[PDB]
Amino acid sequence: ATFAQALQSVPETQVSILDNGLRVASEQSSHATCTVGVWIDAGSRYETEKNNGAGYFLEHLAFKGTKNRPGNALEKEVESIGAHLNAYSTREHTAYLIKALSKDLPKVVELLADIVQNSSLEDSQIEKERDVILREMQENDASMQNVVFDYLHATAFQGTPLAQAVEGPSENVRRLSRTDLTDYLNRHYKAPRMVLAAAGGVEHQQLLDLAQKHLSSVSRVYEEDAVPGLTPCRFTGSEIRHRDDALPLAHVAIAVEGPGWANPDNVTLQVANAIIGHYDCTYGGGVHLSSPLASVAVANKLCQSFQTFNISYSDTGLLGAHFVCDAMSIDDMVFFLQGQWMRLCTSATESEVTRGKNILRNALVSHLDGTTPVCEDIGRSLLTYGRRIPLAEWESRIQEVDAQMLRDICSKYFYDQCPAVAGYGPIEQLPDYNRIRSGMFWLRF
């Protein structure tokens, strides 16, 4: 069967709006289970540096008891049915999701009603969550990848609320109080900025009725008439390096500014990442991998690993690479990476563009398997693009690219640009800004 009607037979996401502006989206499948979640676009971009650890510590406190269900009641109600409860918070989103069976759908929508609306906070609970979140920051300090991405976010978005981390600093955690969490939850948890998403064996009318029963109490009116607007952040080409020579391996991330969510060009840039790919020391391909950077990394024994990333935020983003390697290769590997980027400016052919198109097709269909990633895609699509883009539209956008437009978008976004460099480990051979900036343009043209 041809891929087009294979994509067409996937059911469409159904989206409805309540009276308060709350968005309700559901996707039906043949599965016996379901995943129901709440997505609120309230992250560290909206925190004004007096509440830098508000969202992370609030989602720490969200499952420790509500108003009607104190302490062990909600966890006993959600664990007696075998449901799994998860939450996370990015720099622009905040998600509370539950995986459960299809029978217990009124129970799960009632629980997601009373978690995000009637959360109860207490002094012993807030102090024990304070020492828990301090120990969690202490144990997350030793993972080098999160440190390098936090350094890159700090040095790429200086003077803007996109630099500050999701967890926040230790001083703001030590100085946070009940009233800051209360009014942050009051001004940031509003119905027009809320999506209730569901994926799996779900009836849309039943969940719409239950959402009208439970989620129709939001107090969406501006209490202080303070509209939180999205200030456009500026990408600053800079370089942060954390030299510490007792670490065994060095992590270096190099990233230029991305277009954003609304620009379709990142889709083309996605194909560019599918040209460059990724490599680990545990890959079974060996030497004959199609990516030239991976082949020269295994052929010359350069890296422990490298990975190409494209993070997108509202009107901005970071597109680049991250590699962990020993010290004595770092400079050399940087050169190879830059050469590959400039190949995407000039020597893009039909073969690697077609291979990147096929890899991106397999990535965007294979990721949306199971209820949880489909529900995640639904929530992030209704929060970022404002609608759920169908996968046939993704295929139509993927098929439209060729080597000419891929190489001119790569010349638009990589050629003669100022990158952002973050490093951690034995990074003495990591070059200055001048060598990297000179290497991000060829002299032959």
């Binding site: 936090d150 926040g168 600093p169």
Partner: peptide
């Protein structure tokens, strides 16, 4: 904590 650090203000040098 690695979240305790942030870049200094480069306002006197930036354009």
């Amino acid at each position: 904590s690695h979240t305790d650090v942030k870049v200094p203000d480069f306002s006197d040098y930036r354009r």
